[PDB]
Amino acid sequence: MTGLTNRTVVIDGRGHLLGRLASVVAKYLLQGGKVAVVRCEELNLSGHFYRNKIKFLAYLRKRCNVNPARGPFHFRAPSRIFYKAVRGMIPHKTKRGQAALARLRVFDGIPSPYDKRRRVVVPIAMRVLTLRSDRKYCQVGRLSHEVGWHYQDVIKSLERKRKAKLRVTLKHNRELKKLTVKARENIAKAAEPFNKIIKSYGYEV
Amino acid sequence: GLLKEYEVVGRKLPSEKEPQTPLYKMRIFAPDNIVAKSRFWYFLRQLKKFKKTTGEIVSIKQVYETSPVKIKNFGIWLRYDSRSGTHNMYREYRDLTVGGAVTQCYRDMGARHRARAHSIQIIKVDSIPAAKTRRVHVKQFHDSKIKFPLVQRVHHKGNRKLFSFRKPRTYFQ
Amino acid sequence: MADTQAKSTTAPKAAKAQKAPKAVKAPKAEKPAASEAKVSAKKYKRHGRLFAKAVFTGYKRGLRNQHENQAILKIEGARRKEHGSFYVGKRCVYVYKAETKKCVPQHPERKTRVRAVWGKVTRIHGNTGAVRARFNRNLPGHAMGHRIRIMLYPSRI
Amino acid sequence: MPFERFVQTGRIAKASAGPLKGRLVAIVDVIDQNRVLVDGPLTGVPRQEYRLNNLHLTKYRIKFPYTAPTRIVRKAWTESDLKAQWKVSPWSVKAQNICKRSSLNDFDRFKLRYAKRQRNKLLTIAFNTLKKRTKADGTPRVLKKDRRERLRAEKAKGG
Amino acid sequence: LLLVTGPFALNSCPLRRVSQRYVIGTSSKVDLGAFKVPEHLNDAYFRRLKAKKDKKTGEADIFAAKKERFVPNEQRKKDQKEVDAALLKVIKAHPEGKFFAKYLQNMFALHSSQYPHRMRF
RNA sequence: UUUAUCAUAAAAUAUAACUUAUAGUUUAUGCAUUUUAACACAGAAUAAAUGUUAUUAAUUUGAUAAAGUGCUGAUAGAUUUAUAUGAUUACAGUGCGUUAAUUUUUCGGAAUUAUAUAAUGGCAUAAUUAUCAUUGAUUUUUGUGUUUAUUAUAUGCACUUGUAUGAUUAACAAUGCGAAAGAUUCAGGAUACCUUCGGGACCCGUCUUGAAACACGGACCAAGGAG
RNA sequence: AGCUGGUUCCUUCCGAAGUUUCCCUCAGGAUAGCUGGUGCAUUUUAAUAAAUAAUCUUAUCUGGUAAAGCGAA
RNA sequence: AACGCCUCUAAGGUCGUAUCCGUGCUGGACUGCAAUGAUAAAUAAGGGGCAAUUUGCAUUGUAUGGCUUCUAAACCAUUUAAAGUUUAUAAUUUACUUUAUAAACGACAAUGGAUGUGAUGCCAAUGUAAUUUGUAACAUAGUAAAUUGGGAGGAUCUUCGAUCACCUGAUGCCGCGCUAGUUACAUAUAAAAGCAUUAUUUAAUACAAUGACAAAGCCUAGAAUCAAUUGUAAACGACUUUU
């Protein structure tokens, strides 16, 4: 909320490339922009489904033999995979970096109060713009389930439930928006306090 | 890499007893007046001995593209050096510029063959009039009635907002 | 075209208001005959006016030489080197919070639970409109992603 | 082919990058994939080739004699009344608007915001009986239905 | 340095002097021909009558608080009111909003998402 | 190259009679209409569309070089013991008392023109000397004539918060405050040490090519203790 | 004891060598070379060059490597 | 398809390992997190609790010169680079879904801050402010303050799931506010000495949280651990049982 600019930027993880998004977000956290990233299952990473699957499998091979519980956390969730990507790009070994990680929140499948919130696009992160035509790409949530993410099934139901609440709110919003524009338009010409400011603005709104 | 075309002439030293060593010239593609001379000796050496500083430069002069708005097809004939493997090319480039053709050449040669700017030798320049363009890619441009689709676009990043709330929006209709 | 640039460059100075010279159009647009001499830019972000919303998010450093006597300051509205050049000269302040008073009468009397560190802006750091700043104290770097504040005093015309 | 934009002869292009910037131009000849010969004599950009990465292509297509030197382009452009269509063009009026969104010396800015609150009252004040939702009501009255007829007709009333 | 008046009666700014550097000089011009001009207001005029260190005279072992900023003086009021009146006549010609007449009152907005750099003030 | 214009080839891009089709539709498997990045340099013709020769345009266009021509912003610095035993001198402005004429403001004033001397460039002429080649140019030197412009000298004395005087920071101003002892307030500080942030810091002594070494002595401290 | 270990305050300025030769020498010396210090004599290389030192160039010598040769020894 | 063709491959697409990864199996994030219970101390006392509170007063953040701010409504649902955002007429649907006709922002410039998209702000304030403006008219557009009951609904690490809504009906009457436009009447702030006003650089106020001295306004009356005890447990703590 209260920020240098907005302390909460809800970012749509849909059609963002994973490292492109992670790097721009890392900058924003260091700048104090405190961002929340939602729908990390809709997050994409370039390189075929299969190519990603094998890349991600290579780390679980990495295992601290003596006590593997000291050893590398192979974070299943797409939200936590996003989180690992950002965390590596930040100096997380410093106390400054701890502050910056705390500024970051990462959710798969947009919950709580974030759904009546607008998911902002970061256009550098956009896969469709940056990625070349006819290049096969992976979706992170597909990759996640292969490496053992339990909750692929779970989020898909929770997302559908959310989409449905998000549908009814949209429908009423569009109905309301019609009736707001007519209520300006009909009073506008009928004296002049709307003719004065709109046409002295006269730009293109 | 700045592709400027230069006329360089060089005689081979000057004795009063010994008349008027013969005057050779070349067109040289160089960003540089010095690179114009530098290449000039190297190519001059290939026919006619003439080491600088038993070598006389003469005059270094830049030549004047005749038609830079002019819409012409050039064939350039080219020699390159590969690692085990020096070979010859003919390629044809559609450019404003004989300068622009060569600059697009060093880039293209660089790319495909791994084409060293030092490993490339120019050869010859002619402007192709008229259906002597072997050039399958080139001859597509010559075609009556040349209308062509704009394929795709290019998304300035983002915006004048780093924050683009108006979503690009790959659509465009 | 070097001549044409010279003729084109007379025109915006003419418009400013004055010294009274050249007109040779330039658009500000209806114009009777001009979409000619170009649509701005632009390159933004905001505040602006007590305070450019500014970020102390760094010190001017070598790769690993901290060099804090000058700081990098990102002015929000300045994308470009041109825009940040507007801010070259301006006085800066970082106002920040303290548990404990300190300072009694000279000007106002500040209850110094609110502390201010005063600085000036200098030259243009950024390819992307970050600016250098010197401060009289220098900012502790606990200020990082903290909002620092740049008043538009000293503005030249 | 629905029709995406053609790099065609005369499909026009408003070239962003240049000393041209924001001038409307017409494609003379198709050079190479990277470039097009472009001439906009009524927007007063002189004849040049320019890269298709510097210019992005318009909707507007006018039957053009493709290979035309400046004089015949200038003759074909005012025959098209191309400039006039380009002023109607509401997205170019929107492009002329960002040349006005520039400054509007701050005096003019609080015109908007003082007086926006004139309209901002009147919205909430017009609001609340269609069908949709429900919609209602049979108050509970003597001020509330006389406030609903205080849209409508507007005699006699309250309360 | 500059002589500045709001006009006083509108935007609460006195016959007040301020640095050339404090100021962004906006394109908006009020016809300055009607004025009595600060030929009459000189360095000395607003120079303070007086920060004595105390009760006029001469060494009376004094007391905490004279009037370093504040009475105010009648001569200074009269000077404002005449100048401001002529300001108001010229200033009323221009339409309401941020800063000439009822235009004057409002307190400036480069509103969030607005730009001190491309404001060609 | 390009504008503007002329001739020729020539319309090889487009325009242009007309010939044909799909198809919405229409008429009755086919037609007629029209639309079609679906037809045909298809006829004469047109825009010279491109090429070539000619002429050009505020002569373009590119490049490079040059004028303190005029000018703005920002940054850091500003030893100033200038008599410890060393300089303060130089110039400029302004006033003074030569005149006239024209012009501008139109008040106060200001400029340019009207002298002698010296130098310099530009014109013409002549000689030398070197040089590219002699059609004609360029060079170094010298003299002479003509006219013109430019610059310096003939511009002294008084006064001057004027410019510099070779590290020229101060006009001007505000504020704190030395307020007897007492003692407020302001500024400034990696003292010890605490805190908060960044960055850097591997264990010394030593032999050794190289020591943080998985090389060796040294737990820690005091005092004796060796060119 | 030619070996190992250690050798006790600081700052300023300059600043090495692991090479030569001989040695029962080869874990070391002497010796020459490199190093500093102390100065001395003269500065046209000095106090308010027509004398050089040593690097280019030039002019004048040398050489059996690279390359070449084997229908040259 | 490339290569008229043809072909497991270029694009797209199917099955497929004792593999891999889950299910499962094992430690259980020491305090990562959820749910729920009792929530004391007992009265000559008071203690805690709702305290989110409410008062003197205090602390701290916000905005910091009203405010020179701010925003948990909010541009889809996607294969995706001809991929595509829509409107309307004719049909169609639960679905900006599906079909035909006509257009349209033809990844242009536009657009990317704001349509502040339930049309925010910085407005209210007719003097907009480190005072608040107060008080008169006209005509147009036109505003609303309160309470209770009933029926159904919502909650993914979230600032009170014995909580907050919506709708529908009923009750009456404080008339508490009125706003914008134009226009009347009056005035404190504002004259912050200062001609250099930024410099040591403010706070009346506004909003949000926290506090608690004595006092004030509501509610409620636990257990844990040790001793002693079990053996299902064990080197000792601990575990499991106990009165």
PDB file of C-alpha atoms in Angstrom, chain C residues 6-157:
ATOM      1  CA  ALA C   6      20.651  24.959 -37.304  1.00  0.00           C
ATOM      2  CA  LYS C   7      17.448  26.530 -38.748  1.00  0.00           C
ATOM      3  CA  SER C   8      15.213  24.065 -36.871  1.00  0.00           C
ATOM      4  CA  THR C   9      17.066  24.776 -33.559  1.00  0.00           C
ATOM      5  CA  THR C  10      16.368  28.601 -33.887  1.00  0.00           C
ATOM      6  CA  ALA C  11      12.651  27.939 -33.653  1.00  0.00           C
ATOM      7  CA  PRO C  12      12.165  26.426 -30.109  1.00  0.00           C
ATOM      8  CA  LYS C  13      14.304  29.214 -28.626  1.00  0.00           C
ATOM      9  CA  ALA C  14      12.013  31.689 -30.391  1.00  0.00           C
ATOM     10  CA  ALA C  15       8.957  30.201 -28.727  1.00  0.00           C
ATOM     11  CA  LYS C  16      10.289  30.188 -25.238  1.00  0.00           C
ATOM     12  CA  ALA C  17       9.283  33.362 -24.843  1.00  0.00           C
ATOM     13  CA  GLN C  18      11.717  35.358 -26.900  1.00  0.00           C
ATOM     14  CA  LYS C  19      14.782  36.990 -27.531  1.00  0.00           C
ATOM     15  CA  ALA C  20      12.284  37.571 -30.451  1.00  0.00           C
ATOM     16  CA  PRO C  21      13.810  35.735 -33.545  1.00  0.00           C
ATOM     17  CA  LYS C  22      13.149  33.064 -36.100  1.00  0.00           C
ATOM     18  CA  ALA C  23       9.782  31.387 -36.113  1.00  0.00           C
ATOM     19  CA  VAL C  24      10.343  28.555 -38.817  1.00  0.00           C
ATOM     20  CA  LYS C  25       7.440  26.680 -37.349  1.00  0.00           C
ATOM     21  CA  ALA C  26       7.601  23.810 -34.735  1.00  0.00           C
ATOM     22  CA  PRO C  27       4.285  22.064 -33.907  1.00  0.00           C
ATOM     23  CA  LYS C  28       2.482  22.590 -30.494  1.00  0.00           C
ATOM     24  CA  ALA C  29      -0.258  21.153 -32.274  1.00  0.00           C
ATOM     25  CA  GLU C  30      -3.116  22.240 -34.312  1.00  0.00           C
ATOM     26  CA  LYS C  31      -0.828  23.486 -36.279  1.00  0.00           C
ATOM     27  CA  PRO C  32      -1.896  25.279 -39.522  1.00  0.00           C
ATOM     28  CA  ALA C  33       0.979  23.461 -41.238  1.00  0.00           C
ATOM     29  CA  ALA C  34       2.877  21.334 -38.670  1.00  0.00           C
ATOM     30  CA  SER C  35       3.097  17.857 -37.232  1.00  0.00           C
ATOM     31  CA  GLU C  36       6.666  19.097 -37.914  1.00  0.00           C
ATOM     32  CA  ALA C  37       9.461  19.165 -35.312  1.00  0.00           C
ATOM     33  CA  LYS C  38       8.168  16.308 -33.303  1.00  0.00           C
ATOM     34  CA  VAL C  39       6.148  14.697 -30.555  1.00  0.00           C
ATOM     35  CA  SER C  40       8.081  15.121 -27.233  1.00  0.00           C
ATOM     36  CA  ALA C  41       9.816  12.140 -25.981  1.00  0.00           C
ATOM     37  CA  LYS C  42       8.821  11.024 -23.208  1.00  0.00           C
ATOM     38  CA  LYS C  43      10.358   9.004 -20.207  1.00  0.00           C
ATOM     39  CA  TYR C  44       8.546   9.275 -16.718  1.00  0.00           C
ATOM     40  CA  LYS C  45       7.534   8.309 -13.088  1.00  0.00           C
ATOM     41  CA  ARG C  46       6.619  11.249 -10.726  1.00  0.00           C
ATOM     42  CA  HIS C  47       6.235  13.137  -7.327  1.00  0.00           C
ATOM     43  CA  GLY C  48       7.548  15.915  -8.165  1.00  0.00           C
ATOM     44  CA  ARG C  49       7.509  19.093  -6.284  1.00  0.00           C
ATOM     45  CA  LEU C  50       8.299  19.180  -2.668  1.00  0.00           C
ATOM     46  CA  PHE C  51      10.568  16.311  -3.128  1.00  0.00           C
ATOM     47  CA  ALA C  52      11.153  14.237  -6.239  1.00  0.00           C
ATOM     48  CA  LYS C  53      10.255  10.790  -5.093  1.00  0.00           C
ATOM     49  CA  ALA C  54      13.724   9.646  -4.913  1.00  0.00           C
ATOM     50  CA  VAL C  55      15.473   6.482  -3.882  1.00  0.00           C
ATOM     51  CA  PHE C  56      18.716   6.168  -2.079  1.00  0.00           C
ATOM     52  CA  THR C  57      19.329   2.706  -3.314  1.00  0.00           C
ATOM     53  CA  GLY C  58      23.043   2.674  -3.453  1.00  0.00           C
ATOM     54  CA  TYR C  59      26.247   4.399  -3.034  1.00  0.00           C
ATOM     55  CA  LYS C  60      28.502   5.369  -5.937  1.00  0.00           C
ATOM     56  CA  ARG C  61      30.799   2.347  -5.832  1.00  0.00           C
ATOM     57  CA  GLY C  62      33.708   0.564  -7.507  1.00  0.00           C
ATOM     58  CA  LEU C  63      32.883  -3.199  -7.963  1.00  0.00           C
ATOM     59  CA  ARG C  64      34.071  -3.641  -4.372  1.00  0.00           C
ATOM     60  CA  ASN C  65      35.091  -0.111  -3.295  1.00  0.00           C
ATOM     61  CA  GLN C  66      32.256   1.405  -1.370  1.00  0.00           C
ATOM     62  CA  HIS C  67      33.065   5.148  -2.062  1.00  0.00           C
ATOM     63  CA  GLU C  68      30.120   6.719  -0.146  1.00  0.00           C
ATOM     64  CA  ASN C  69      31.078  10.445  -0.336  1.00  0.00           C
ATOM     65  CA  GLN C  70      28.828  10.609  -3.383  1.00  0.00           C
ATOM     66  CA  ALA C  71      25.599   8.626  -3.656  1.00  0.00           C
ATOM     67  CA  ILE C  72      23.390   7.259  -6.481  1.00  0.00           C
ATOM     68  CA  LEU C  73      19.961   8.667  -6.338  1.00  0.00           C
ATOM     69  CA  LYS C  74      17.211   7.552  -8.670  1.00  0.00           C
ATOM     70  CA  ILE C  75      14.820  10.337  -9.436  1.00  0.00           C
ATOM     71  CA  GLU C  76      11.481   8.695 -10.221  1.00  0.00           C
ATOM     72  CA  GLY C  77      10.442  10.845 -13.074  1.00  0.00           C
ATOM     73  CA  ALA C  78      13.868  10.857 -14.673  1.00  0.00           C
ATOM     74  CA  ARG C  79      14.246   8.015 -17.160  1.00  0.00           C
ATOM     75  CA  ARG C  80      16.708   9.932 -19.282  1.00  0.00           C
ATOM     76  CA  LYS C  81      19.950  11.790 -18.940  1.00  0.00           C
ATOM     77  CA  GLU C  82      18.097  14.939 -20.163  1.00  0.00           C
ATOM     78  CA  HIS C  83      15.439  14.623 -17.439  1.00  0.00           C
ATOM     79  CA  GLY C  84      17.902  13.997 -14.649  1.00  0.00           C
ATOM     80  CA  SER C  85      19.817  17.069 -15.944  1.00  0.00           C
ATOM     81  CA  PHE C  86      16.815  19.167 -14.762  1.00  0.00           C
ATOM     82  CA  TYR C  87      17.645  17.942 -11.196  1.00  0.00           C
ATOM     83  CA  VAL C  88      21.336  18.784 -11.514  1.00  0.00           C
ATOM     84  CA  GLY C  89      21.575  21.559  -8.848  1.00  0.00           C
ATOM     85  CA  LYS C  90      18.574  20.796  -6.677  1.00  0.00           C
ATOM     86  CA  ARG C  91      18.745  20.648  -2.825  1.00  0.00           C
ATOM     87  CA  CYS C  92      17.877  17.247  -1.279  1.00  0.00           C
ATOM     88  CA  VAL C  93      16.766  16.234   2.214  1.00  0.00           C
ATOM     89  CA  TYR C  94      16.293  12.847   3.859  1.00  0.00           C
ATOM     90  CA  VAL C  95      13.766  13.069   6.684  1.00  0.00           C
ATOM     91  CA  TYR C  96      13.774  10.128   9.008  1.00  0.00           C
ATOM     92  CA  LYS C  97      12.624   9.004  12.459  1.00  0.00           C
ATOM     93  CA  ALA C  98      14.311   9.045  15.839  1.00  0.00           C
ATOM     94  CA  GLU C  99      13.278   7.883  19.314  1.00  0.00           C
ATOM     95  CA  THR C 100      15.446  10.601  20.913  1.00  0.00           C
ATOM     96  CA  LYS C 101      15.390  14.431  20.682  1.00  0.00           C
ATOM     97  CA  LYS C 102      18.926  16.086  20.725  1.00  0.00           C
ATOM     98  CA  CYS C 103      18.478  19.551  19.126  1.00  0.00           C
ATOM     99  CA  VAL C 104      17.048  22.625  20.905  1.00  0.00           C
ATOM    100  CA  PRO C 105      16.511  26.440  19.726  1.00  0.00           C
ATOM    101  CA  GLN C 106      18.484  27.920  16.641  1.00  0.00           C
ATOM    102  CA  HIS C 107      15.887  27.527  13.888  1.00  0.00           C
ATOM    103  CA  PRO C 108      12.554  26.544  14.619  1.00  0.00           C
ATOM    104  CA  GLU C 109      12.885  24.465  17.687  1.00  0.00           C
ATOM    105  CA  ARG C 110      12.816  20.966  16.296  1.00  0.00           C
ATOM    106  CA  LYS C 111      11.722  18.321  18.852  1.00  0.00           C
ATOM    107  CA  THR C 112      14.359  16.231  16.906  1.00  0.00           C
ATOM    108  CA  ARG C 113      12.375  13.060  16.848  1.00  0.00           C
ATOM    109  CA  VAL C 114      12.311  13.965  13.172  1.00  0.00           C
ATOM    110  CA  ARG C 115      15.841  14.370  11.784  1.00  0.00           C
ATOM    111  CA  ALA C 116      16.783  15.800   8.428  1.00  0.00           C
ATOM    112  CA  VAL C 117      20.082  15.370   6.495  1.00  0.00           C
ATOM    113  CA  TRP C 118      20.536  18.020   3.816  1.00  0.00           C
ATOM    114  CA  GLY C 119      22.307  17.534   0.483  1.00  0.00           C
ATOM    115  CA  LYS C 120      22.507  18.822  -3.113  1.00  0.00           C
ATOM    116  CA  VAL C 121      22.153  16.983  -6.366  1.00  0.00           C
ATOM    117  CA  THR C 122      25.229  16.970  -8.700  1.00  0.00           C
ATOM    118  CA  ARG C 123      25.751  15.257 -12.126  1.00  0.00           C
ATOM    119  CA  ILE C 124      23.974  12.667 -14.155  1.00  0.00           C
ATOM    120  CA  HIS C 125      24.923   9.131 -13.107  1.00  0.00           C
ATOM    121  CA  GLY C 126      22.594   7.157 -15.333  1.00  0.00           C
ATOM    122  CA  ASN C 127      22.172   6.041 -18.876  1.00  0.00           C
ATOM    123  CA  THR C 128      18.819   5.535 -17.187  1.00  0.00           C
ATOM    124  CA  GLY C 129      18.229   8.860 -15.302  1.00  0.00           C
ATOM    125  CA  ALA C 130      19.819   8.130 -12.003  1.00  0.00           C
ATOM    126  CA  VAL C 131      21.710  11.121 -10.695  1.00  0.00           C
ATOM    127  CA  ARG C 132      24.642  11.611  -8.316  1.00  0.00           C
ATOM    128  CA  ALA C 133      24.098  13.476  -5.077  1.00  0.00           C
ATOM    129  CA  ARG C 134      26.471  14.807  -2.379  1.00  0.00           C
ATOM    130  CA  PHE C 135      25.004  15.320   1.055  1.00  0.00           C
ATOM    131  CA  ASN C 136      26.352  17.521   3.772  1.00  0.00           C
ATOM    132  CA  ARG C 137      26.177  14.575   6.161  1.00  0.00           C
ATOM    133  CA  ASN C 138      26.097  11.633   3.780  1.00  0.00           C
ATOM    134  CA  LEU C 139      23.125   9.251   4.465  1.00  0.00           C
ATOM    135  CA  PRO C 140      23.892   6.075   6.668  1.00  0.00           C
ATOM    136  CA  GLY C 141      22.887   3.368   4.017  1.00  0.00           C
ATOM    137  CA  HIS C 142      20.312   2.072   6.448  1.00  0.00           C
ATOM    138  CA  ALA C 143      18.518   4.297   4.018  1.00  0.00           C
ATOM    139  CA  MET C 144      18.388   1.744   1.114  1.00  0.00           C
ATOM    140  CA  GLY C 145      15.130   1.541  -0.648  1.00  0.00           C
ATOM    141  CA  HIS C 146      14.184   4.333   1.741  1.00  0.00           C
ATOM    142  CA  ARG C 147      12.381   7.261   0.185  1.00  0.00           C
ATOM    143  CA  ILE C 148      14.592  10.314  -0.005  1.00  0.00           C
ATOM    144  CA  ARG C 149      13.252  13.648  -0.869  1.00  0.00           C
ATOM    145  CA  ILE C 150      14.456  16.397  -3.332  1.00  0.00           C
ATOM    146  CA  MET C 151      13.033  19.958  -3.180  1.00  0.00           C
ATOM    147  CA  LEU C 152      13.039  21.878  -6.538  1.00  0.00           C
ATOM    148  CA  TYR C 153      15.040  24.723  -4.952  1.00  0.00           C
ATOM    149  CA  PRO C 154      17.760  25.468  -6.682  1.00  0.00           C
ATOM    150  CA  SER C 155      15.889  25.751 -10.030  1.00  0.00           C
ATOM    151  CA  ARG C 156      17.402  27.854 -12.755  1.00  0.00           C
ATOM    152  CA  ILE C 157      14.691  29.383 -15.081  1.00  0.00           C
TER     153      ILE C 157
END
